[PDB]
């Protein structure tokens, strides 16, 4: 074992990248400087390197952790500045990390305790919304997912349709994700821009066990209507879901 030890070397910032960090630290408190043509060049170095390191599918958690540590040692303001840069799609490292199921890196970002986890990308979605649909295979990962849910607003509504993370999870029949969202305070009575609830999404898609889980929520209101007056019960009938429909009638009236 020890004679066969393979040391992983620390990753270190390039000269140009460390220079950009030091430049940013001195102008972080001068908004005029930050807005200048010349300073856009250093900001470009920052964003290009950081996204290359943090946000590819193949991203190395040890490299991201070394970078976080190096930024921190330049300045905590530099660390919080870089961690929350968004590219031209409005995506942060936390959006890409989550999307890739790179949960070690998600864990690193949350642990910096400088991450804004409620940031909407250009598509209009938060990292929690992306997480609702991200592949998860080990239980160690679902713990990071639940940390992410805990650290931000699970009740945010997306710019397109006002959908919620709970609605996205319901619509994919992701019971594991519905449970974690519920456990972290997702409100089941939020309505999207058309008046739909998660209960209605579950009736549309026929997810019987999700319907049970939503109805098991203490304040769940099965009487809400969408903009057209449709109810969860009426939707279940229209979509041909006779057993969901009986479940819903029985809960409204027992």
């Amino acid at each position: 074992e020890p004679e066969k030890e393979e040391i992983r070397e620390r990753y270190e910032l390039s000269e140009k990248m460390l220079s950009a960090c030091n430049l940013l630290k001195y102008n972080i408190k001068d908004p005029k400087a930050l807005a200048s043509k010349d300073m856009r060049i250093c900001l470009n170095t920052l964003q290009h390197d950081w996204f290359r390191v943090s946000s590819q599918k193949s991203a190395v958690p040890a490299m991201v952790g070394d970078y976080i540590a190096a930024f921190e040692a330049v300045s905590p303001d530099v660390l919080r500045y870089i961690i929350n840069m968004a590219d031209g799609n409005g995506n942060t490292a936390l959006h890409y990390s989550v999307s890739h199921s790179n949960f070690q890196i998600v864990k690193l970002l949350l642990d910096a305790d400088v991450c804004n986890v409620d940031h909407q990308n250009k598509a209009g979605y938060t990292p929690i919304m992306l997480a609702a649909l991200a592949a998860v295979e080990a239980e160690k990962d679902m713990q990071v997912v639940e940390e992410l849910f805990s650290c931000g607003d699970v009740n945010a509504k997306a710019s397109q349709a006002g959908q919620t993370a709970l609605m996205l999870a319901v619509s994919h029949g992701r019971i594991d994700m519905v449970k974690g969202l519920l456990a972290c305070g997702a409100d089941v009575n939020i309505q999207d821009d058309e008046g739909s609830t998660a209960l209605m999404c579950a009736s549309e898609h026929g997810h019987v066990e999700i319907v049970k889980l939503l109805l098991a929520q203490p304040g769940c209101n099965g009487h809400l209507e969408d903009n057209d007056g449709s109810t969860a019960l009426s939707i279940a009938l229209e979509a041909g879901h006779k057993d969901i429909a009986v479940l819903l009638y029985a809960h409204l009236n027992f």
Binding site: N91, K122, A161, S196, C201, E204
Partner: peptide, 19 residues
């Protein structure tokens, strides 16, 4: 008839990128 958000099954790629 997919003319309401609740009837759609959105995509991971739709969540990450728009225009």
């Amino acid at each position: 008839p997919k003319n309401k958000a609740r009837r759609r099954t959105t995509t991971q790629m739709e969540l990450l990128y728009a225009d």
